Amino acid sequence: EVQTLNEDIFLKHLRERILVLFEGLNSIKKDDLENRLNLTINFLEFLLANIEDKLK
Ligand SMILES: [Mn+2]
Q: Motif MKD: residue span?
């Protein structure tokens, strides 16, 4: 029940590791949104250029 020096150190590192893991997870999540957004933009931009080619 008492909290030992070794436990405090181990808990403190694990805290840091989880926070680093969340940073990693948040980046993968944001890059995933960034890629799907860019893929739809590129599609729409390609479509827009097809349309304008046919209007020329
Ligand atoms: Mn999170």
A: 29-39
